[PDB]
Amino acid sequence: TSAMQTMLFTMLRKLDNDALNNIINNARDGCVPLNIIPLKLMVVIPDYNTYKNTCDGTTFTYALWEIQQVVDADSKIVPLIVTALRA
Amino acid sequence: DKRAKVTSAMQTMLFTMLRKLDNDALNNIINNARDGCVPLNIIPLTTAAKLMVVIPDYNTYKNTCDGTTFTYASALWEIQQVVDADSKIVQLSEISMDNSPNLAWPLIVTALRAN
Amino acid sequence: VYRAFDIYNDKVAGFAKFLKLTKYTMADLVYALRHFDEGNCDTLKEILVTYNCCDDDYFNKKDWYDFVENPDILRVYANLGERVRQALLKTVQFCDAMRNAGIVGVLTLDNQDLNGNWYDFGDFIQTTPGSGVPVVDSYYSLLMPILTLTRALTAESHVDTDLTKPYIKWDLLKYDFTEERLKLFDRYFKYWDQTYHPNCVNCLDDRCILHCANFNVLFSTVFPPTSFGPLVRKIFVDGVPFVVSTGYHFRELGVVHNQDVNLHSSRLSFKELLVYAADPAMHAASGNLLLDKRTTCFSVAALTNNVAFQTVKPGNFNKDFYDFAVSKGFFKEGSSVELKHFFFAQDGNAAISDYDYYRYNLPTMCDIRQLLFVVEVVDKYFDCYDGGCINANQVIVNNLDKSAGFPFNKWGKARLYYDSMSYEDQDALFAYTKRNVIPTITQMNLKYAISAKNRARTVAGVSICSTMTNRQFHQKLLKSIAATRGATVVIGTSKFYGGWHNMLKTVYSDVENPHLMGWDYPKCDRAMPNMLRIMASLVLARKHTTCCSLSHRFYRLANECAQVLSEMVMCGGSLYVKPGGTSSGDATTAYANSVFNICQAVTANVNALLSTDGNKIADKYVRNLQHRLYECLYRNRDVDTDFVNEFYAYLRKHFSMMILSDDAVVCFNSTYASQGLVASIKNFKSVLYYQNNVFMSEAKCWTETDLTKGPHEFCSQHTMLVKQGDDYVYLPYPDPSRILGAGCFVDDIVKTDGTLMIERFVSLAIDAYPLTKHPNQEYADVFHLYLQYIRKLHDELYWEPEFYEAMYTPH
Amino acid sequence: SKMSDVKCTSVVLLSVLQQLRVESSSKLWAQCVQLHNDILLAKDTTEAFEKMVSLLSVLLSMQGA
Ligand SMILES: [Zn+2]
Ligand SMILES: [Zn+2]
């Protein structure tokens, strides 16, 4: 059952584009999104290290989406869920 | 005993369609004909006691079944058990002009025949 | 000025558009709707605009003319149907107005403006008043095609036939409408000097059957659609009542009554259980009323408390062969050989769109006299085979594991059903079908195979009794037809062994300036009308001369029409009504397609030879041929064998066809087609538009002026002229992109075991061996890759090339 | 070799996605099949990779095994 995912991941690593490997590295570090990227993007920030490496103030480099929605994990404004649109 | 197998299968199918079948209103609709010879397209139209409407989008829910009781086949029908496209039960208090994009289409409106 | 004329004398025969109250006439309208050409169709535009059917900006829209893309062009045509009905009601207020005067003459189309009044009383002869007769055969014969293309009847069906009045509440329990049919006839077609029968049981020969079915369809396009369908009564067995069908009410053959009906029975044997389970009555009665708002057809849908949603899975990509191909340096940048054939997934909304594609289907009235002469010609085309009824010991049934239809599929496929019943039971069922109607319901599934386009393909599985009886009849007829070599229809001949070469040589025969041509029919199975399907079945039953009387053949035709043409389909978890168009379940639908194709071709030739003006024809033998063609079409009611033989010989000499179902190759004499005396392609376009209700776009019909390169494409194969040991022979080679696609994507039947994988690979290499001899090197490298891959597969467990060479040598 | 590999990855990714029964949501599976069929019809080099990253976000937004 694993072999299909192994082949998928080896083909994806062979593809060698920027956005694919970026998203793979984010997800292996833990930074996964929570919905479909619109061609509105929701992302769960695991730790402050990924916030520092990816979010610069309000500018956010991800594949780039300019992000101002900050509340919390706990659904009270201050993990962190941030949703943005393509600018 | 495979011939008899499908024989008994069809026979039990016939008997279970028969136990769901015999009413008196169908007998009255037959006895209001000339010689009892009647089309087929009007047996469930005027005999069966439950209507199913599948509604693809919101504008036809708005133009067909707006309310609790709706009108079809010159009779009044009483709604129950509105179901989305995923066989999960939906309360009638959700189907709105703004909340429609958030719920899976189409929808299954199951009604019972109101006298 | 240019105008369409319908003239006939000793000098000139045929409806011709040359140069000589409304601006335009009924003949012009029928010509513009019957001889359509989108390059030069200004007359149709002017007709549609001048009387407020729609606006010029609607024509300024792209594809204003089509029936398939943007199917809202019927809205207008319906307003012209209203005009047609108004002008057709003045044809009975003039005939009975001149008959009294006592005038013998012919009525032509070209004497009547679009309102309906007449002129030019120049040709008639005067006789004693009260004893006249007009000749109005050609009039209605040519006016027929636009009496269901525009309908007029949705306009007619009002409480006193005024368009400003509500719809009639007809009685819901009345079903026969025979008196209303006769009243419609005597109001609209009073002077049609042949007997019309409201039911088709009362007709005399198959030609009368066609005539009465055409009139029945035109008269039945105005009745409540909740009425056509099985007729049921209440029957009792061992005390408990049933609701089973004791008749049927077509649009085509009026009301038909079973003659073997058993009221107050006591027991049901195997055949009775089979027929009663096949009945839609028990299923439509035991179920809930449904209103499905997705589709525009009628719908009585039960059998479940919820709809089923079925999806189509994606393909299985094979990595080993693709890795081998990329190691062989394929799919490099800037190449002509790449992957383009894929497995597309689907939702079920795809199934609903497929049923809407079934919605792309109208009621058609076709012409009648040209239909009867085309049917005589097509019978002459089929005059070299042998038919007849056979017993149950003379059917050879192949591939016994197809779908056994609904609701029979719940306990097995057709194999169990055929090994259950003895021969005598099947003969008794057949003999019962010879006097009875068994309406039937078909299962519909989605098809799972290669395509180049995103759309979903579907397939239909028909019940066991209908296929069993079509099997007896057309097992005999098709085994007679397909075991021949060198005929017009090429079905069941292997292209191998020089077979394609012999086929092409027979296509050449002795034609003078051979040019090649081909076509395809847009939306074949969805738009094929009812008239032509009945006509094909009638031909296949006209091959019955010695076994059946009139009654048996009529009951067989009724059974065929009620089981294939207009039955109800189980689509998902619903029962809908299927308006028309063929089913994909038997081989006699590929042969109905063949007959349909031949019909289309013959009709095209007839139009091209009769709509051309003989005064510019320099020959006089073809001029006399055209004169006799007009005579045999619009004159004699009897059948004339000599002229039919003459015209069949003319076609076989000047128009050589190579026919497979829906896919044809035409070899024709070029100078004649330049003069128009054999079928061009614009004639086919016009015929398809006016008689099949699709528009055949010009980008899919091709023309090849050099014969030494063969058919551009036929049966999904390309051909090249190669030399093989001091012989120049034609070889078929495929599109190799399809071969690569079938190699890289397989569908998980072969993803388990390797033997069937090697079978598929060797078959693919056989279909694509001849690619070696094409000038390009890449195709031979494709063949070499396939050979190397089959070699590698054989080693890790037909491998030498010669095995595939001998596949294409005619030895 | 940069236009075929993307289609092969799209096909295998949609097969994996189906093998985790996302078809039990209408909207999500409809979006997935739409993106898949739009990839398998692409004749340009650029937007195919956008749709590929969108489908990989679809995969890695739900808790993949
Ligand atoms: Zn008749
Ligand atoms: Zn016979």
Side-chain angles (χ1 to χ4, degrees), chain A residues 1-39 41-87, chain B, chain C, chain D:
Chain A
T1 76
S2 279
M4 52 193 281
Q5 294 85 17
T6 75
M7 267 91 72
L8 167 63
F9 283 127
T10 191
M11 214 176 299
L12 277 193
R13 177 207 31 81
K14 288 285 299 302
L15 288 206
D16 211 38
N17 193 46
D18 66 89
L20 282 85
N21 298 54
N22 171 36
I23 298 314
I24 296 156
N25 303 307
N26 302 145
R28 68 186 291 277
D29 293 9
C31 176
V32 298
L34 295 189
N35 58 6
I36 299 89
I37 277 168
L39 266 53
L41 172 47
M42 185 178 288
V43 56
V44 67
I45 310 292
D47 211 42
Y48 82 108
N49 56 47
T50 67
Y51 173 80
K52 264 60 193 179
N53 310 337
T54 71
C55 202
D56 215 348
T58 80
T59 64
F60 187 74
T61 171
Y62 205 61
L64 69 87
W65 303 95
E66 181 74 29
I67 72 166
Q68 320 87 350
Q69 296 223 0
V70 283
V71 286
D72 53 350
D74 314 328
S75 288
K76 295 180 291 295
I77 310 194
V78 309
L80 272 295
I81 292 91
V82 56
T83 62
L85 192 65
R86 192 185 308 278
Chain B
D1 63 328
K2 48 195 178 295
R3 173 169 164 88
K5 176 50 189 177
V6 309
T7 314
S8 316
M10 270 172 315
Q11 188 176 1
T12 72
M13 175 198 94
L14 275 161
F15 293 154
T16 179
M17 306 156 92
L18 294 156
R19 312 230 181 275
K20 205 209 162 297
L21 196 148
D22 200 307
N23 66 102
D24 207 0
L26 174 56
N27 277 109
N28 266 331
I29 198 54
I30 289 173
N31 287 312
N32 301 313
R34 289 182 334 250
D35 50 350
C37 202
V38 71
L40 195 61
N41 317 329
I42 62 185
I43 297 315
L45 172 54
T46 67
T47 288
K50 174 142 78 141
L51 165 67
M52 293 175 68
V53 166
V54 183
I55 281 172
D57 44 351
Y58 188 79
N59 272 329
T60 186
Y61 183 79
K62 183 62 63 67
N63 262 321
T64 303
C65 293
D66 204 72
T68 317
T69 77
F70 59 101
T71 301
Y72 172 61
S74 177
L76 273 74
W77 313 86
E78 189 169 356
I79 196 171
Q80 94 187 14
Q81 194 191 9
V82 180
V83 183
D84 57 39
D86 212 345
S87 279
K88 303 319 161 42
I89 284 176
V90 169
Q91 325 305 301
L92 208 169
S93 75
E94 307 180 356
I95 308 312
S96 87
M97 192 69 254
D98 57 354
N99 193 26
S100 81
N102 316 109
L103 55 92
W105 290 92
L107 317 175
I108 300 191
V109 165
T110 304
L112 283 182
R113 183 159 258 285
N115 293 111
Chain C
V1 286
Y2 286 160
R3 285 288 199 270
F5 264 109
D6 168 39
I7 63 188
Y8 167 59
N9 46 45
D10 52 354
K11 292 291 184 184
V12 290
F15 197 60
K17 180 180 183 292
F18 45 74
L19 53 95
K20 87 183 70 161
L21 59 88
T22 65
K23 190 160 169 56
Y24 304 82
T25 185
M26 313 286 307
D28 176 76
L29 163 70
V30 186
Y31 193 70
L33 274 70
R34 197 173 182 181
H35 279 229
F36 187 55
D37 186 306
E38 74 266 24
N40 46 0
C41 48
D42 72 332
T43 192
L44 184 46
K45 288 187 188 171
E46 290 186 354
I47 296 299
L48 280 192
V49 63
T50 188
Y51 292 142
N52 214 7
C53 276
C54 192
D55 198 53
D56 49 355
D57 290 86
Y58 181 54
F59 311 137
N60 173 83
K61 177 191 175 331
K62 184 50 72 177
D63 308 337
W64 73 271
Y65 47 84
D66 203 319
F67 277 167
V68 258
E69 346 255 27
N70 162 109
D72 94 310
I73 190 59
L74 313 145
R75 211 160 33 43
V76 356
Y77 288 168
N79 314 307
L80 273 195
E82 193 288 327
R83 184 56 47 79
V84 158
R85 167 198 161 283
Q86 174 59 260
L88 166 48
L89 257 243
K90 247 58 185 291
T91 249
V92 136
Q93 179 251 91
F94 168 117
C95 297
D96 181 65
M98 269 4 220
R99 144 128 146 212
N100 302 9
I103 314 191
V104 195
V106 68
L107 260 54
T108 80
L109 290 177
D110 59 357
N111 286 40
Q112 177 185 18
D113 74 325
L114 214 57
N115 315 311
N117 201 354
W118 305 68
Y119 37 90
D120 292 27
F121 300 102
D123 175 282
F124 316 84
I125 187 166
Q126 190 272 330
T127 322
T128 172
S131 309
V133 69
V135 173
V136 286
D137 204 65
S138 88
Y139 185 95
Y140 290 154
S141 287
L142 302 196
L143 201 46
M144 279 184 178
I146 66 159
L147 267 290
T148 66
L149 184 77
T150 59
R151 316 129 144 194
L153 294 207
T154 80
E156 189 276 337
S157 187
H158 280 167
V159 300
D160 303 69
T161 78
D162 312 82
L163 279 185
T164 61
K165 300 210 159 182
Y167 276 118
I168 306 170
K169 190 262 159 194
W170 293 68
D171 193 314
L172 300 202
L173 290 184
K174 179 180 168 47
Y175 63 88
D176 59 341
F177 305 96
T178 288
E179 322 287 346
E180 279 107 347
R181 282 211 177 118
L182 274 168
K183 189 155 148 208
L184 281 149
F185 186 70
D186 304 340
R187 190 186 296 174
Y188 291 125
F189 301 122
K190 183 178 179 180
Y191 283 103
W192 181 265
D193 44 37
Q194 197 176 1
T195 172
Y196 155 63
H197 305 91
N199 314 336
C200 277
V201 186
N202 300 321
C203 319
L204 277 63
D205 59 67
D206 49 26
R207 324 167 49 85
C208 203
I209 283 187
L210 283 164
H211 164 217
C212 297
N214 184 239
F215 269 127
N216 270 16
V217 173
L218 169 59
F219 287 163
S220 157
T221 186
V222 76
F223 286 172
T226 181
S227 297
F228 315 129
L231 295 175
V232 288
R233 203 199 302 263
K234 173 162 279 303
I235 306 309
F236 291 94
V237 68
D238 203 75
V240 63
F242 277 3
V243 184
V244 306
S245 198
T246 191
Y248 197 87
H249 179 187
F250 304 111
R251 310 165 177 79
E252 298 89 5
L253 323 180
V255 53
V256 178
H257 284 275
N258 295 115
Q259 289 175 347
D260 194 326
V261 54
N262 296 15
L263 273 76
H264 306 69
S265 63
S266 72
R267 192 179 300 109
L268 302 174
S269 166
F270 200 90
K271 163 255 196 170
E272 298 82 334
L273 295 162
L274 293 202
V275 58
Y276 284 138
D279 275 284
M282 277 313 154
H283 299 268
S286 297
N288 304 116
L289 162 64
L290 186 134
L291 179 51
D292 193 331
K293 263 297 186 172
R294 289 179 292 202
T295 63
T296 66
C297 319
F298 208 76
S299 44
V300 292
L303 263 55
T304 270
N305 301 312
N306 56 5
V307 195
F309 284 72
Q310 174 215 50
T311 44
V312 191
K313 315 206 316 301
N316 200 335
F317 155 78
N318 207 326
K319 198 188 66 64
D320 304 338
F321 174 85
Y322 179 55
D323 183 352
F324 193 81
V326 291
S327 87
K328 285 310 189 176
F330 282 92
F331 318 101
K332 296 180 53 186
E333 170 51 74
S335 158
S336 297
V337 175
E338 67 273 1
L339 266 174
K340 284 184 316 177
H341 294 202
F342 293 104
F343 275 33
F344 294 71
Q346 300 287 3
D347 310 336
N349 288 188
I352 301 316
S353 46
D354 264 7
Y355 209 75
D356 185 87
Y357 289 137
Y358 255 123
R359 184 275 318 255
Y360 284 165
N361 181 356
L362 302 186
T364 69
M365 164 171 276
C366 319
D367 199 332
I368 182 55
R369 299 290 168 212
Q370 74 176 358
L371 185 55
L372 298 158
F373 175 59
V374 162
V375 71
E376 288 311 310
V377 178
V378 168
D379 171 50
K380 264 311 284 183
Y381 264 87
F382 279 78
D383 212 356
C384 321
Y385 320 104
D386 61 270
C389 304
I390 66 178
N391 320 320
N393 71 330
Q394 283 181 35
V395 293
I396 183 65
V397 56
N398 50 2
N399 185 47
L400 323 183
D401 206 339
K402 326 188 193 51
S403 88
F406 178 89
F408 300 93
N409 47 3
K410 316 213 169 183
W411 317 276
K413 311 273 196 171
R415 202 165 302 219
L416 176 55
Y417 283 33
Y418 282 169
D419 55 28
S420 59
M421 312 176 67
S422 173
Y423 299 154
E424 302 88 343
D425 314 278
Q426 326 185 29
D427 308 293
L429 164 57
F430 188 23
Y432 171 80
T433 57
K434 281 171 161 175
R435 287 169 65 227
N436 303 263
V437 183
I438 314 179
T440 296
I441 47 185
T442 64
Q443 187 91 48
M444 189 170 292
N445 318 311
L446 277 174
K447 211 188 97 169
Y448 175 52
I450 301 105
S451 161
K453 288 172 174 58
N454 49 321
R455 86 172 169 101
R457 296 180 64 88
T458 186
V459 71
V462 192
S463 87
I464 195 57
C465 55
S466 298
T467 191
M468 213 179 306
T469 76
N470 282 107
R471 266 218 191 80
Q472 309 214 0
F473 276 171
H474 306 324
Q475 185 73 255
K476 176 153 179 161
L477 178 61
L478 308 176
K479 284 333 182 203
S480 280
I481 291 172
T484 195
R485 298 288 167 275
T488 303
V489 305
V490 48
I491 311 189
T493 77
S494 279
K495 69 192 179 298
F496 293 165
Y497 309 123
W500 193 284
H501 181 31
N502 296 333
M503 289 164 45
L504 289 190
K505 293 303 290 184
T506 63
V507 183
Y508 304 154
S509 239
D510 263 299
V511 194
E512 163 79 39
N513 314 316
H515 281 162
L516 277 296
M517 200 176 70
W519 52 66
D520 194 298
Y521 296 134
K523 319 274 189 303
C524 164
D525 68 279
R526 301 288 149 99
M528 193 199 326
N530 279 358
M531 286 296 295
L532 299 192
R533 189 51 169 81
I534 311 164
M535 188 274 265
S537 199
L538 263 177
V539 165
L540 307 175
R542 155 180 300 222
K543 190 62 69 177
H544 279 271
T545 174
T546 175
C547 49
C548 309
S549 161
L550 267 298
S551 88
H552 319 280
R553 272 167 32 180
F554 178 83
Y555 266 118
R556 276 315 301 180
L557 164 62
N559 271 338
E560 296 301 328
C561 169
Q563 300 155 351
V564 173
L565 194 62
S566 160
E567 81 283 350
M568 307 161 185
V569 303
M570 172 82 177
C571 167
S574 302
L575 285 196
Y576 304 112
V577 61
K578 152 184 186 175
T582 190
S583 178
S584 315
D586 196 290
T588 184
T589 63
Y591 292 87
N593 281 312
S594 315
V595 180
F596 167 53
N597 220 327
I598 304 180
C599 177
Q600 288 285 327
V602 175
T603 315
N605 300 287
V606 168
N607 308 129
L609 187 54
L610 198 143
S611 53
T612 183
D613 204 78
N615 305 277
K616 270 72 71 176
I617 292 177
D619 194 317
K620 292 315 170 193
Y621 152 74
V622 307
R623 188 137 190 191
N624 282 166
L625 188 75
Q626 178 180 0
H627 199 270
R628 280 163 288 151
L629 206 68
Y630 192 106
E631 297 157 0
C632 167
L633 270 190
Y634 308 146
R635 262 307 84 65
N636 234 313
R637 301 290 181 58
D638 188 86
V639 57
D640 175 90
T641 51
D642 56 74
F643 182 41
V644 169
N645 291 323
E646 210 166 316
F647 195 91
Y648 168 71
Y650 177 96
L651 289 178
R652 293 278 303 174
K653 150 81 158 169
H654 287 335
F655 199 111
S656 89
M657 265 186 272
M658 177 173 41
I659 288 287
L660 183 47
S661 87
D662 204 359
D663 203 0
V665 191
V666 165
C667 172
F668 58 101
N669 189 15
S670 290
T671 184
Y672 273 126
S674 88
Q675 290 192 344
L677 317 178
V678 290
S680 165
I681 204 67
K682 52 167 185 177
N683 310 138
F684 271 91
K685 176 184 300 182
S686 156
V687 169
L688 274 189
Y689 179 75
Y690 94 89
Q691 203 184 282
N692 204 12
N693 278 334
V694 301
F695 164 84
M696 197 184 69
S697 60
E698 204 268 345
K700 297 285 97 176
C701 45
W702 58 266
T703 304
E704 191 155 359
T705 64
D706 171 283
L707 195 141
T708 75
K709 320 303 300 156
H712 179 99
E713 166 57 270
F714 161 87
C715 191
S716 48
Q717 322 279 19
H718 296 276
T719 191
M720 54 201 158
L721 176 50
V722 64
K723 166 191 200 170
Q724 190 257 348
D726 189 37
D727 301 71
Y728 272 61
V729 307
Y730 285 80
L731 290 204
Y733 71 101
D735 194 359
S737 297
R738 155 183 310 117
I739 312 288
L740 269 172
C744 314
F745 309 121
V746 301
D747 41 18
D748 303 72
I749 307 92
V750 287
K751 284 292 203 173
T752 59
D753 204 334
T755 78
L756 300 87
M757 190 170 330
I758 316 184
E759 290 274 70
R760 188 46 200 174
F761 268 108
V762 304
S763 175
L764 269 174
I766 293 158
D767 308 303
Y769 152 74
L771 279 162
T772 309
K773 280 78 175 176
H774 204 240
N776 177 23
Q777 167 63 23
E778 307 172 345
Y779 308 128
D781 261 8
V782 185
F783 174 41
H784 292 320
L785 195 174
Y786 270 105
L787 182 59
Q788 287 306 314
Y789 198 89
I790 301 157
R791 260 207 186 105
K792 152 157 176 42
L793 295 201
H794 174 234
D795 308 321
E796 57 87 21
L797 296 192
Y798 54 81
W799 40 88
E800 293 177 350
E802 71 76 20
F803 174 109
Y804 311 93
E805 201 155 90
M807 281 275 168
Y808 284 62
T809 51
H811 282 207
Chain D
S1 177
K2 284 315 269 180
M3 194 42 65
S4 158
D5 57 356
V6 54
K7 317 217 156 171
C8 281
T9 70
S10 197
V11 174
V12 60
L13 167 65
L14 197 77
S15 158
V16 183
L17 259 184
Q18 181 270 326
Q19 273 297 339
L20 293 174
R21 68 188 183 273
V22 62
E23 57 194 2
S24 316
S25 158
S26 158
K27 296 184 278 187
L28 211 172
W29 171 273
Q31 294 158 302
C32 291
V33 307
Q34 186 45 55
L35 286 198
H36 166 95
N37 289 342
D38 201 358
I39 285 181
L40 291 197
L41 283 185
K43 301 181 213 62
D44 302 357
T45 320
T46 79
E47 53 274 57
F49 288 99
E50 269 81 6
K51 312 196 178 310
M52 194 43 221
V53 310
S54 189
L55 278 181
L56 192 61
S57 88
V58 175
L59 172 54
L60 275 191
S61 174
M62 194 222 77
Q63 177 55 259

